[PDB]
Design an enzyme around this catalytic site. Sequence first.
Site, short mmCIF file in Angstrom:
data_model
loop_
_atom_site.label_atom_id
_atom_site.label_comp_id
_atom_site.label_asym_id
_atom_site.label_seq_id
_atom_site.Cartn_x
_atom_site.Cartn_y
_atom_site.Cartn_z
N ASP A 40 -7.20 5.15 1.59
CA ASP A 40 -6.52 4.13 1.50
C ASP A 40 -7.11 2.81 0.50
OD1 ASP A 40 -4.32 1.70 1.47
OD2 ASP A 40 -4.71 1.72 4.26
N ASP A 236 -3.39 0.72 -5.33
CA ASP A 236 -3.24 0.90 -4.05
C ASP A 236 -3.18 2.77 -3.53
OD1 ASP A 236 -3.06 1.13 -0.99
OD2 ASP A 236 -0.97 0.20 -1.52
C1 LIG Z 1 0.79 6.98 0.28
C2 LIG Z 1 1.17 7.45 2.11
C3 LIG Z 1 2.54 7.57 2.20
C4 LIG Z 1 1.89 6.24 2.47
C5 LIG Z 1 1.82 5.71 3.86
N1 LIG Z 1 0.83 5.07 3.34
C6 LIG Z 1 0.51 4.27 5.01
O1 LIG Z 1 0.17 4.75 6.48
C7 LIG Z 1 -0.54 3.17 4.04
C8 LIG Z 1 -2.38 3.20 5.20
C9 LIG Z 1 -1.15 2.12 5.68
C10 LIG Z 1 -1.56 0.70 4.81
C11 LIG Z 1 -2.21 -0.21 6.15
N2 LIG Z 1 -2.17 -1.38 5.88
C12 LIG Z 1 -3.06 -2.53 6.24
N3 LIG Z 1 -2.60 -3.87 6.04
C13 LIG Z 1 -3.36 -4.43 6.50
C14 LIG Z 1 -5.15 -4.20 6.53
C15 LIG Z 1 -4.93 -2.97 6.99
N4 LIG Z 1 -4.21 -1.99 6.68
C16 LIG Z 1 -1.53 -1.24 5.48
C17 LIG Z 1 -0.85 -0.48 5.05
C18 LIG Z 1 0.70 0.12 4.14
S1 LIG Z 1 0.41 -0.23 1.94
C19 LIG Z 1 -1.78 0.40 2.93
N5 LIG Z 1 -2.11 0.44 1.52
N6 LIG Z 1 -1.65 0.68 3.99
#
Ligand SMILES: C[C@@H]1C[C@H]1CNC(=O)[C@@H]1C[C@H]1[C@]12CN(c3ncccn3)C[C@H]1CSC(N)=N2
Length: 393
Positions: A40, A236
Amino acid sequence: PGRRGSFVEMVDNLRGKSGQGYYVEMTVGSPPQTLNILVDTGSSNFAVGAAPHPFLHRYYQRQLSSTYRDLRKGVYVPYTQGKWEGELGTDLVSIPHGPNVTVRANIAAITESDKFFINGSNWEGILGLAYAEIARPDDSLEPFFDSLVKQTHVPNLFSLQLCGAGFPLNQSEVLASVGGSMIIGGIDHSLYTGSLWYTPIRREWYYEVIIVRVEINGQDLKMDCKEYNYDKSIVDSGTTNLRLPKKVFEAAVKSIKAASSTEKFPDGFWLGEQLVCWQAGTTPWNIFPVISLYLMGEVTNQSFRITILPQQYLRPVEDVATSQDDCYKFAISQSSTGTVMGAVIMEGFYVVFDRARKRIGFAVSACHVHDEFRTAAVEGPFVTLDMEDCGYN
Ligand SMILES: C[C@@H]1C[C@H]1CNC(=O)[C@@H]1C[C@H]1[C@]12CN(c3ncccn3)C[C@H]1CSC(N)=N2
């Protein structure tokens, strides 16, 4: 000269797909507990399931690790479409198909969550590769990559080749398939074709970049370039789609509809909710336009462009009937938090996160999906003036 691949130990170390995430195997604790970990680049915490959950087949058991240290502090991370919450600690961490090093790193042991874990995704935690500024609960919690660099001789750079298959994978196929490479500490020349072009990291928080021009099949979207970066643009790997600011999304979809107008699709398709299907082999790639994003270059008044195909922005999905049709969802969607260059974009390119030189490199991926007529591209230079003005303040 022929391209040598000098990081064989890390090539092909990822699995997964754009809709569920790309992950790497890691170990935590003593004796080592193996977990699959989402890569991530949009967050900065190393956070692992540490309690039973219906979608976890395994989790970190702190009581079984002799090297576990309790930081006696919680962390709560609510976000738009979910939450994770847990307990902070440190432990020894390794990447089996990574550098041959073990480091002591912060770990958030996830005890409660909401729409975080994904049924069938095969991952049990996340590796936030962005910078300390956006670490939770605050910037004092050193991110994993910062620990790795500080404790070892690993160079301050990593690179990602995310490999989309171009067709749907079930849990079985996705478990057996190579999903790409994360090269820790270097650039593997086997993973790309042509040249690497670099854009500056605008600020070290997210991997923030500046887009200076957008084209759909060569036609300028012709917006004030600030609109493209309102209120930021980031790379991202933890987001599936290319996400665009509201105004930009509306203009882009108008243009993509115009270009593809020989076939009409329901509103639900363009909203990214509903699949479209064609008879096996007959997907009309050629009616859909290419999309070019121009990025600020490293040289004054120079930009370059990255160009993706519908084979990137149409995400393969399974039908309800599991028929022989080839089906897809539109993987461009609206954002209220800036441009997000997600996994479907990244699948076109080998992306170099050159932290040491505060820059991100793009080259055409050796594993991008294309057809006999068109390929993804990274091309430059272009004379572009007043590019700093494209950044939002
Ligand atoms: C391509 C994959 C199918 C998609 C599923 N993606 C995810 O589960 C991502 C890990 C999450 C997060 C963890 N997040 C967060 N926000 C602030 C501080 C720490 N963690 C936001 C959340 C959504 S966007 C992001 N880049 N990371």
